[PDB]
């Protein structure tokens, strides 16, 4: 009531004094420091009357930048720091195919070679971290290792792999079942069936892993504070005192990950 | 100098005291919105007096990080994900260039390796995607390929092209009109007239594209999105 109003007015006075002190301290610094501003980074952006068509189930990290004509299929994911610039031409991302951290997918200027085609990425493909794609036509069920660079005009056929730290030269086709790699990107070896199983399992594991990141990066301020308080409360345990009190403190469901992302599916 | 640093630190102390007072005033009123974990990233960050100087007609992506004494010419562009960190020395970016997506142009972090060479970028210079320019220098109207890894002490002459993914070793000079590629970088072939014309046209194409990207980035922040984020149930 009256006490609450008085305390509110005192708080207003204190806030005004604090802001004045902040301004004075900024003045003494010589106005050299560049003040932090509101985040102007747009996760999804338009360029020329063209909007991305990100599907409902896709996980697009807030630090990612999906720009221009980008079409992304269900179950796929775009991870932190990734850039998909489809301003000049089209970029189509298939279903279940994840583009990993700091990766760049860009499309040529439709005249880099005269007969340029849009960047097409098939289904259930996985692209490693820091990879660079500049006009490829990666077919479905393919693997691109982390750090690999795919120049314009290349096609990665189904069930083919590009070794990490490779450079596939322009107009180079990787046949099915090969592990083309190296800086010239020459033939290394044939793919074994275990490698194919590993590729499919990695794609499915990333589809499974994108969900917790999506559920964590979309929380509100109120939910974040509650989860932080719960995490602090259950960080350390004391079974002896609980046994003395006859209680059993159990971790809330907000701090429990699904068993399908644990190393071996641990129920307990 | 040393007199300026003392005033800078005292200003930090007073600003910290003022922020603490503001937080205390917020707590009396019951508000706790200062606890929000907002991103502290600044597209233009300074180190004491070393502040980037960006021309008005230059596109700098909001996610690009420019730190220290960095000079950007008119018509140049720093695209998304770029990190241009020059603190121990200066990073000079000319007019009409284009630091393309996820590229890195930085200077050496210590004097133990020797003398830190300032990074100089000419005019109409094309830097490929995810390319590292670590204390090198490039003349105007040159091309740096995708994934290139130029090191310090490297001079790339005018009309010189560095092939994609090539790693130019320390203290290497690329002669004018020659393409250097592979690991380590070695002479491969001589540039043709058509490639020179394409290199010249790419700079103008990216300069025009940067204007559209800046126009789409300078629009007022959407209030519908802000309201939707505010109410999440």
């Amino acid at each position: 009531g009256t006490l609450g109003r008085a305390i509110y007015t005192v708080g207003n006075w204190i806030r005004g004094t604090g802001q004045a002190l902040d301004r004075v301290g900024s003045l003494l610094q010589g106005s050299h420091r560049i003040e932090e501003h509101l985040s102007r980074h747009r996760t999804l952006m338009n360029v020329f009357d063209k909007s991305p068509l990100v599907d409902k189930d896709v996980f697009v990290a807030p630090s990612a930048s999906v720009i221009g004509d980008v079409q992304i299929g269900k179950g796929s994911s775009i991870w932190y720091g990734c850039v998909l610039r489809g301003d000049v031409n089209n970029i189509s991302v298939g279903s279940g195919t994840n583009i990993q951290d700091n990766t760049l997918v860009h499309v040529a200027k439709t005249n880099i070679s005269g007969k340029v085609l849009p960047t097409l990425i098939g289904d259930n493909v996985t692209v490693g971290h820091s990879a660079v794609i500049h006009g490829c036509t990666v077919e479905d069920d393919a693997f691109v290792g982390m750090g690999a660079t795919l120049l314009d005009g290349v096609v990665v056929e189904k069930h083919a792999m590009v070794a990490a730290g490779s450079l596939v030269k322009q107009n180079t086709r990787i046949p099915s079942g090969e592990v083309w790699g190296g800086n010239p990107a020459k033939f290394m070896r044939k793919l074994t069936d275990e490698e194919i199983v590993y590729i499919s399992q990695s794609a499915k594991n990333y589809i499974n892993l994108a969900q917790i990141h999506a559920s964590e990066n979309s929380k509100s301020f109120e939910q974040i504070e509650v989860e932080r308080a719960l995490r602090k409360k259950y960080a350390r345990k004391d079974e002896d005192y609980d046994s003395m009190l006859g209680i059993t403190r159990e971790t809330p469901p907000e701090l429990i990950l699904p068993d399908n992302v644990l190393p071996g599916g641990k129920p307990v | 100098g040393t007199l300026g640093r003392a005033f800078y630190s005292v200003g930090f102390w007073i600003r910290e005291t003022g922020q603490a007072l503001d937080r205390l005033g917020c707590r009396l009123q019951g508000k706790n919105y200062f606890r929000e974990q907002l991103s502290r990233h600044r597209t233009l960050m300074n180190v004491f007096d070393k502040a980037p100087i960006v021309d008005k007609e230059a596109f700098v992506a909001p996610s690009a990080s420019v730190i220290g004494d960095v000079h950007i010419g008119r018509g140049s562009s720093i695209w998304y994900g770029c990190v241009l960190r020059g603190d121990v020395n200066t990073v000079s970016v000319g007019s009409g260039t284009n630091i393309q997506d996820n590229s890195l142009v930085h200077v050496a972090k210590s004097n133990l390796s020797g003398k830190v060479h300032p990074t100089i970028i000419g005019d109409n210079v094309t830097i490929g995607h995810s390319a590292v320019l670590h204390g090198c220098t490039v003349e105007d109207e040159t091309f740096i390929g995708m994934g290139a890894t130029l090191l310090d002490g490297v001079v790339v002459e005018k009309h010189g092209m560095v092939a994609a993914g090539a790693l130019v070793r320390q203290n290497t000079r690329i002669p004018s009109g020659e393409v250097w590629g592979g690991n380590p970088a070695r002479f491969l072939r001589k540039l043709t007239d058509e490639e020179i014309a394409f290199i010249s046209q790419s700079a103008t194409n990216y300069s025009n594209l940067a204007q559209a990207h800046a126009a789409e980035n300078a629009k007022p922040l959407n209030v519908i999105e802000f309201e939707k984020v505010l109410r999440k149930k």
Binding site: - | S9, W13, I14, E16, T17, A20
Partner: protein, 75 residues
């Protein structure tokens, strides 16, 4: 000269900065508690001097009493 007020203020500032250093924090983390430490150090030093004077006076009185008690042995 060196008064108790200044040595107390220096000890308070030093113990504040020492506490901040022991926790891997910057020396001038919270300036307000540095000021509080300076004030508390000055107060404690002045009180210590004021207590020391009275303590010495009491010791002198008590030793006078003890010597007077011992001197009675010769009668």
């Amino acid at each position: 000269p060196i008064s108790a007020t200044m040595v107390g203020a220096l000890l308070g500032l030093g113990t504040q900065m020492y506490s901040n250093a022991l926790r891997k924090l910057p020396y001038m983390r919270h300036p307000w508690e540095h000021v509080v430490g300076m004030g508390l150090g000055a107060v404690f030093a002045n009180q210590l001097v004021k207590w020391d004077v009275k303590l010495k006076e009491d010791l002198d009185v008590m030793l006078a009493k003890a010597r007077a008690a011992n001197e009675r042995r010769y009668f």
